[PDB]
Amino acid sequence: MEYTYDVVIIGSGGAGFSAGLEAIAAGRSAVIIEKMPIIGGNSLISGAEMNVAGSWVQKNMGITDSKELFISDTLKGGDFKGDPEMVKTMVDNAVGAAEWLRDYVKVEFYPDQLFQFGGHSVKRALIPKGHTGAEVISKFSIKADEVGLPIHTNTKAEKLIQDQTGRIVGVEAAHNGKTITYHAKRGVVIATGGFSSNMEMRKKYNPELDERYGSTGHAGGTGDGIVMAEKIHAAAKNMGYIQSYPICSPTSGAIALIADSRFFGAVLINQKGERFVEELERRDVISHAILAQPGRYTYVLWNQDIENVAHTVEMHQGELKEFTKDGLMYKVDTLEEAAKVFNIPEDKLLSTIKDVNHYAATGKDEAFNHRSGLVDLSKGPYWILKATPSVHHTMGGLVVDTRTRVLDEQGKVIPGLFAAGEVTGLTHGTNRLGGNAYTDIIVYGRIAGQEAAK
Amino acid sequence: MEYTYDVVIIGSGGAGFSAGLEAIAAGRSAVIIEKMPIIGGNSLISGAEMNVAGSWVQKNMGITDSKELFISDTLKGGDFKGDPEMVKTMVDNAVGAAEWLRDYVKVEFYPDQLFQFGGHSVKRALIPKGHTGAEVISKFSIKADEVGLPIHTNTKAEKLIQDQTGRIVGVEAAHNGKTITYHAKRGVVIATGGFSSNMEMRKKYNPELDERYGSTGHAGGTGDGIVMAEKIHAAAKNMGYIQSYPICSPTSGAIALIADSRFFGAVLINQKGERFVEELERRDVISHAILAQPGRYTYVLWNQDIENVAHTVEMHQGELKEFTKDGLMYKVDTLEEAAKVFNIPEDKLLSTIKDVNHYAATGKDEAFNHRSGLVDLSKGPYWILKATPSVHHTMGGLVVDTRTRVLDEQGKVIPGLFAAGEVTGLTHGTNRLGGNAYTDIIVYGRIAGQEAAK
Ligand SMILES: Cc1cc2nc3c(=O)[nH]c(=O)nc-3n(C[C@H](O)[C@H](O)[C@H](O)COP(=O)(O)OP(=O)(O)OC[C@H]3O[C@@H](n4cnc5c(N)ncnc54)[C@H](O)[C@@H]3O)c2cc1C
Ligand SMILES: Cc1cc2nc3c(=O)[nH]c(=O)nc-3n(C[C@H](O)[C@H](O)[C@H](O)COP(=O)(O)OP(=O)(O)OC[C@H]3O[C@@H](n4cnc5c(N)ncnc54)[C@H](O)[C@@H]3O)c2cc1C
Ligand SMILES: O=C(O)/C=C/c1c[nH]cn1
Ligand SMILES: O=C(O)/C=C/c1c[nH]cn1
Ligand SMILES: [Cl-]
Ligand SMILES: [Cl-]
Ligand SMILES: [Cl-]
Ligand SMILES: [Cl-]
Ligand code: NA
Ligand code: NA
Numbered sequence A, B: 001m002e003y004t005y006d007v008v009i010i011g012s013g014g015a016g017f018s019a020g021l022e023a024i025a026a027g028r029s030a031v032i033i034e035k036m037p038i039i040g041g042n043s044l045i046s047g048a049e050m051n052v053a054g055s056w057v058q059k060n061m062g063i064t065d066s067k068e069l070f071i072s073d074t075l076k077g078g079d080f081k082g083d084p085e086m087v088k089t090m091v092d093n094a095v096g097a098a099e100w101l102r103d104y105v106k107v108e109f110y111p112d113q114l115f116q117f118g119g120h121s122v123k124r125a126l127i128p129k130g131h132t133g134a135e136v137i138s139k140f141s142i143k144a145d146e147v148g149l150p151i152h153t154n155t156k157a158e159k160l161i162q163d164q165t166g167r168i169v170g171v172e173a174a175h176n177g178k179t180i181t182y183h184a185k186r187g188v189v190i191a192t193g194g195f196s197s198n199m200e201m202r203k204k205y206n207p208e209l210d211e212r213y214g215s216t217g218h219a220g221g222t223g224d225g226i227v228m229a230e231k232i233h234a235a236a237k238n239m240g241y242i243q244s245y246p247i248c249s250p251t252s253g254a255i256a257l258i259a260d261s262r263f264f265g266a267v268l269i270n271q272k273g274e275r276f277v278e279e280l281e282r283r284d285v286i287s288h289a290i291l292a293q294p295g296r297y298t299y300v301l302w303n304q305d306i307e308n309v310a311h312t313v314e315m316h317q318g319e320l321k322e323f324t325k326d327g328l329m330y331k332v333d334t335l336e337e338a339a340k341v342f343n344i345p346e347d348k349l350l351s352t353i354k355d356v357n358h359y360a361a362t363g364k365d366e367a368f369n370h371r372s373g374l375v376d377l378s379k380g381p382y383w384i385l386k387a388t389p390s391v392h393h394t395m396g397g398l399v400v401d402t403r404t405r406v407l408d409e410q411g412k413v414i415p416g417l418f419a420a421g422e423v424t425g426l427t428h429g430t431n432r433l434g435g436n437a438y439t440d441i442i443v444y445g446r447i448a449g450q451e452a453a454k
Helices: A014-025 A041-045 A056-061 A067-077 A084-105 A134-147 A199-205 A224-231 A257-263 A283-291 A304-310 A317-325 A335-341 A346-362 A436-453 B014-025 B041-045 B056-061 B067-077 B084-105 B134-147 B199-205 B224-231 B257-263 B283-291 B304-310 B317-325 B335-341 B346-362 B436-453
Strands: A002-010 A030-033 A156-162 A168-175 A178-190 A242-248 A267-269 A298-303 A329-332 A382-394 A405-407 A413-419 B002-010 B030-033 B156-162 B168-175 B178-190 B242-248 B267-269 B298-303 B329-332 B382-394 B405-407 B413-419
Touching: A002 A014, A002 A168, A002 A436, A014 A030, A014 A041, A014 A084, A014 A134, A014 A178, A014 A436, A041 A134, A067 A084, A084 A134, A084 A436, A156 A178, A156 A224, A168 A413, A178 A224, A178 A436, A224 A413, A242 A283, A257 A298, A257 A304, A257 A317, A257 A382, A267 A283, A267 A346, A283 A382, A298 A304, A317 A329, A329 A335, A335 A346, A335 A382, A413 A436, B002 B014, B002 B168, B002 B436, B014 B030, B014 B041, B014 B084, B014 B134, B014 B178, B014 B436, B041 B134, B067 B084, B084 B134, B084 B436, B156 B178, B156 B224, B168 B413, B178 B224, B178 B436, B224 B413, B242 B283, B257 B298, B257 B304, B257 B317, B257 B382, B267 B283, B267 B346, B283 B382, B298 B304, B317 B329, B329 B335, B335 B346, B335 B382, B413 B436
Parallel strands: A002 A030, A002 A178, A178 A413, B002 B030, B002 B178, B178 B413
Antiparallel strands: A156 A168, A168 A178, A242 A382, A267 A298, A298 A382, A329 A382, A405 A413, B156 B168, B168 B178, B242 B382, B267 B298, B298 B382, B329 B382, B405 B413
16 A cells, blocks of 8 residues: 655654644645554643743733743753754744644633743743643644544554655555555655653663653654654754653653642652652752652642642542552541551651641741742641652754754755654753743644645 | 871861861860961852851841751752761751851851852851951951961971871971971861862863863862872762852953842843843853853943942952953943943844843843842943853862761771861762852861860
8 A cells, every 4th residue: 555645744743733734724635644543642641731922821811921031941941052043933933833723723721820830930831721632632633634634543654765866755654564655745744752762762862761760651752753764864963861750650650740739739758758859849859859768759748628729630530540559649538547558657747747737827838948838738638649750751853954854964954854843852952841842842843844835 | 397286187268277276175286287378278268158047147137047948958959969967967057157156256247148049048148247258267367376276387288197006196298398297196187178279180070170161269279188088098979079150250260259249230241242041040050051152251241330239349359450450351431332342242232231221120021030130230330241160169078977087988987087178078969059168167177176176
């Protein structure tokens, strides 16, 4: 079997969907090939919070922002190693990208909630309904079906097809044990995500991130797009810069979105029954703090009063069930029971929470200077979750220009080849800020589909 | 020539002076040997700001603090690698150390000023009169003369004397081209400071910090105390952790205390005439930001209105004269002249300052979110200073216990040998917080003199 389309997109995450919808809208034929049996990749299981300076939600909330500040925040976050034009183009197109999600894809965002990720000077992360990428990918899928964008699941790209001029003119893919050739008349878009779930690639570029660490990502995040492009002499950069997320499942590696309760008053408790870091510190600080605790894990503890504001249990019931079945999470009536289930010294936990309750009442955390104010934890019920850092995002990847054209080892455009999303390596410097992956994948996914369609 | 004292102290910085005064006060004979022609080492040229949780000045200013928070701040600052008992003993003795400086040494601190160094959750750095160590070392010197503590300048310790039991029983030193033997009946205190000015030792332990970087320290900061103790099998740790200070002379390496005006409204301007980092960001962030600018330097720009509050020109007139003579600093009437003297694009500088003036008026810095509020810079005169990062403090050094006893490679006490101050390597982890060196050198200097005298 062979197929022919104008634009062949590899991957059904936010970057690939954005490229596909733009290619179809330009009047071209397009397909997305997806190696998993389900669509959406890490974009699906993402929190999908998306930074935008100058959003309609900021206006609703009375929050002032500027592109200049979003750019400076972002460049600083990556230790000033990100490509300034890549960051500028991301920020310059972020409002349009989010309004396009709202108006064209019909993604629903909360009109009056924003998150301020570490490193951002103001609250600027839009929040999709449900606080996950489920809303985003489901709406993308509906819109793709409406406009006539086919998605071929269980179809694994294995090789880029390069003609004698050096132009990329298609993709060889595996489906049901056979090779299928996808001819691409105008362009191939690599939108395959990162390599957080490729242990050998992690160890090659960052030996510390070995089998001691899980991955927050899906099993398909294995760097295939980098490997396939390097075979035809695409350049890569920043491959060793790989970030972790602090509060993840010790068993599966999955992120614990349910533990976003720490932004609403949950406390981090070590095996000794003691707090050990400000719960609102930067994520890398929290990760290092946890790895310095006994056993290299923490507990996250909160009560019904916090859930009634935060809703992270209601919003992440699959995590609740999975973590509970894995023995990583308990719902308990009393702090004494919270200590018992995890062999935490009872007297120390009770003393810690007595202090927390006093700090909540005064607004002054005399142990760690909690920046927003603690919440009284004297009454339950309680959730207590065991968590540890897990590998989360690969900042490195393919070298592209701001038009998403992939460049070779001499900086020359590889004709017919584009790349967008976590597979690229020039936006985030040494360290991506929270909420900036979604901005990157939508902005550059759209550009890639536009450029491939030309 | 030979001398005999109960306690022989090597170095006349804050650690050595503290040890000497305690030894004399215990009723023992003591001497300080100092290799330079002047006393005070880096403690002399320090800002000498000293962190204390629970000081009389905090009480005057209505500021609440706690030892728990000072400990947690400190441990976090060094990436959780500092020795917890060393940090606890430092914090537990900080109030007593500062009250001892005030009441016994007669150091004058401002009663109503404190500095909040990066990483500290509350304002807690006491400020000596004059905003330098000159006050501290001059008062130490007077007190030493009053109590009968001799200081032998131009006397360089070269070898520790070890008897057949393994006990350290003296020091061989060079003076006027001859070797002088100092017999120590009860103890030798190594208080020799750090190795920021030893290029070969820097390169050995941190190859990046080579000849591209100057040193903020005096010429005597060469690691001699580490070398002399390792010869008799003292252990060392954390030697590769070496911190820089962001705003220093590109010619001499000296710190620019005069540029503490950035805590009162001065702006950082690159060669392009643009701001590029929040001026109140963490020092390591500022250092990296500067090294990312054209030429790897910044300018620091402020006006008379800022000086009338900050006083950093009045307090650091020697810097003013030296930097000006070196072509690194100008006093100018207009922003146009500030641009001219350093070949900064005039239009860009004027546009940058127009923005600053608007941000000062509104309190909202739309470019970098200055956390305290900018100050109008429309009227002069102005100072503009060229600055770059310089090597500043060596966190590593000798292994001691909390009694300042030096330990060998098997963790065993070396009898008769003590060490205190920047020469030790267990307090600050990977990164010392501002103001914490002075706390360390006084607390542990006092302990070392007390323990050596026993
Ligand atoms: C749990 C989690 C939470 C996150 N939360 C946030 C957040 O709130 N905000 C934020 O900004 N970022 C967040 N991130 C990061 C962000 O979600 C991702 O970086 C981003 O979604 C990646 O999008 P993408 O389109 O590049 O790739 P993906 O979404 O990973 O999609 C790539 C797709 O390509 C497919 N593919 C790969 N190789 C092949 C091949 N050979 N053939 C065919 N198909 C292939 C994969 O199967 C996958 O479906 C989160 C990440 C995770 C894991
Ligand atoms: C410019 C500057 C500003 C600073 N500002 C601050 C600040 O505000 N707050 C803060 O907390 N920290 C600050 N620091 C750091 C702090 O001042 C130092 O870490 C601290 O003063 C070191 O004290 P010390 O007693 O260990 O050593 P030093 O003060 O360096 O004294 C050691 C002495 O031993 C002598 N010596 C060395 N080898 C020999 C030998 N072989 N024989 C004899 N004598 C020898 C040296 O000549 C020197 O005089 C600053 C540092 C500098 C350089
Ligand atoms: O890594 C990110 O950008 C966001 C992670 C996250 C956590 N909770 C919601 N999103
Ligand atoms: O490095 C420190 O602890 C302090 C440096 C400084 C700058 N200005 C006054 N002190
Ligand atoms: Cl703007
Ligand atoms: Cl690289
Ligand atoms: Cl206290
Ligand atoms: Cl070490
Ligand atoms: Na990447
Ligand atoms: Na040290």
